[PDB]
Amino acid sequence: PALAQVAVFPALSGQTLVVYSSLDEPLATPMIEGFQKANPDIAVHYEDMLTGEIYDRIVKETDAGKKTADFAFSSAMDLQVKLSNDGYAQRSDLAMSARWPAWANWRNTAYALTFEPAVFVYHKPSFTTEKPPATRAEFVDYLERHAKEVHGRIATYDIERGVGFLFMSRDQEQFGDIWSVIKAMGAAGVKVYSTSSAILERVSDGRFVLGYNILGSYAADWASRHPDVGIVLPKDYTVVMSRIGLVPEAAANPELGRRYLEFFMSKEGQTIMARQLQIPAVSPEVAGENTANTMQAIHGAQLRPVPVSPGLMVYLDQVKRSRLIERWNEALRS
């Protein structure tokens, strides 16, 4: 089945915006509240769903001649650019469009809105006589040196079930020998999940000792409430994604969709992300440590972000996508 956690926010004043988003609802709530305070006559129908489902649903609904979401917001950058390339989005010519960083804008249609790293997470109580691995080489070595302790107690994204796939496809482009890492994880009996939150809950209470390619923003959110979750930005390289927002062609209320997009692009909206949600901002109007500018300044070539402006060519086609997934299953089982 196709799943969604739906949350409906009535107009503050006493028109409903429909959002399909992969941003976990509790972290989304401050953005929703900010939008609603700015727009007291707008109800918000927020559907929290997997990135692959955002894609599938928009394609299915649009193809069916039906209406679809007014705003699609997804960490599966490739699937968002594909929708936009195949005619499932519509152009949004807005206030901040021309000044939006060029890398973060495909044809005033798909906009990259955040700057979020894929990180290691660890159970702090489990790393008391040795510090956790900080590179992929160290990760593999740790797994080997602690074969029995780690076995079935590490986790990563099930790339078959979209941000996981993105991160793997980027790992393959940096790291020639990513497959040694995948193989090592399979020998350690790696468990795979569709969400960072599932992995974070299990690392938090020590069921798992390590997670790989976890969303750093979510990890920082967890760690702020659960002191036993530690985070390592990998020192060999750190893949960075950006959540992409667009207004579907078949939006019932494209105007409300564009309003929400404008809010997400605004100084106010981007400051809520940076300052409240531990999601680093892309807006050239926002200063501070939780920004793409400062992160690039501090970390440099360690960071491996993904550009939007070249379009679909940056990303793997459907058949190569399928091939990479069967290779990944092949490595985890070898």
Nearer to Mg ion, 116 or 249 (CB): 116
Nearer to Mg ion, 24 or 116 (CB): 24
Residue 310: CA count within 13 A, CB half-sphere: 6
Q: Would the annotation count 22 as a binding residue?
A: yes
CB of residue 112 to Mg ion, shortest distance in Å? 17
CB of residue 195 to Mg ion, shortest distance in Å? 6
Distance CA 273, CA 151 (A): 36
Nearer to Mg ion, 55 or 100 (CB): 55
CB of residue 142 to Mg ion, shortest distance in Å? 28
Distance CA 57, CA 53 (A): 6
Binding site for Mg ion (CB under 5 A): 22, 24
E strands, 279-323, in order: 303-305
Distance CA 53, CA 63 (A): 15
DSSP string across 217-286: HHHHHHHHH-TTEEEE--SS-EEEE--EEEEETTBS-HHHHHHHHHHHHSHHHHHHHHHHS---B--TT-
The residue of the chain with the least Cβ separation from Mg ion equals: 22
CB of residue 256 to Mg ion, shortest distance in Å? 22
Nearer to Mg ion, 24 or 171 (CB): 24
Q: Would the annotation count 126 as a binding residue?
A: no
Q: Do 67 and 24 contact (CB within 8 A), yes or no?
A: no
Binding-site residue ranges for Mg(2+)? 22, 24
